[PDB]
Design a protein around this ligand. Sequence first.
Ligand SMILES: CCCCCCCCCCCCCCCC(=O)O
Ligand SMILES: [Cl-]
Length: 133
Amino acid sequence: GMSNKFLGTWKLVSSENFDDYMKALGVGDATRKLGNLAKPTVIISKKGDIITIRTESTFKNTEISFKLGQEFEETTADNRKTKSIVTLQRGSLNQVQRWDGKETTIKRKLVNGKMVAECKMKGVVCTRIYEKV
Ligand SMILES: CCCCCCCCCCCCCCCC(=O)O
Ligand SMILES: [Cl-]
């Protein structure tokens, strides 16, 4: 299953192309301004086969609990009501969000101890790097 190296508290240290990714989601100007200034902490925890990913930031908090491969209702930070699935592909934790005929992916993988989150929407790719704290 998911590597236990995912479990723990993660702090954003780098974000690239987040503004254009938010635009792709349809996020308004003022919201993106605070979204680009946020330095969220991500906590990944596990209770049995239920994985929990909590994101904490001054602006917004989110939390999703899921089992690999099983669709679930999700509310994103920008307040999208999506049906989402998390899968494992070569150790990569890949989350797909679907809503209003749209689709975006957030792929999380471990690289030299860092967690690297690739966010894709249409032809827009955003990379966010976290470090274990
Ligand atoms: C939680 C801070 C950002 C809040 C601003 C809302 C803009 C919508 C962005 C929602 C998708 C976030 C993708 C980041 C994924 C991650 O790095 O874990
Ligand atoms: Cl923050």
